[PDB]
Amino acid sequence: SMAESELMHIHSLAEHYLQYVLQVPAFESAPSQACRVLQRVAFSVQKEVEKNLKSYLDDFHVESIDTARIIFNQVMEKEFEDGIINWGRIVTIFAFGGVLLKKLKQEQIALDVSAYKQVSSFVAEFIMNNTGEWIRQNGGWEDGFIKKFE
């Protein structure tokens, strides 16, 4: 119930970050404060990664949403192996979701509004299943996340 709502809030955050990444309409409402902070911090990471891991990223292809989900889950499983969760690492999850979605679109003639939906879903599931309780204990998105990153 709380966990259900928590998953749905993570999903909306992921959707909005990935829409931002594909330069696609909000058009319903203005981003919340947490959305804006997330877009700023997660994008700085996407940028740093794509810049400084370019050689590593070039040595594989994301031909499918199926495969994006696979590479994402294995990179993420290995990242969080030590069991350490913090706000900074949580930001890297959104960012890598973004790196792959952008990889997917550059290899597709046209991905559909559906690709970014399916990616937002697997991003959200990982964050929720791996960090959802931690987020809940550390002030959630309005206090925790925003006060951490101004």
Binding site: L53, Y56, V75, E79, I84, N86, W87, G88, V91
Partner: peptide, 24 residues
Amino acid sequence: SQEEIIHNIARHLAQIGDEMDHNI
């Protein structure tokens, strides 16, 4: 080496996340 790739990405991301978390 796919291992080497997804290993080096994972570690860089943990490193950049941990850096982010302690930034001032």
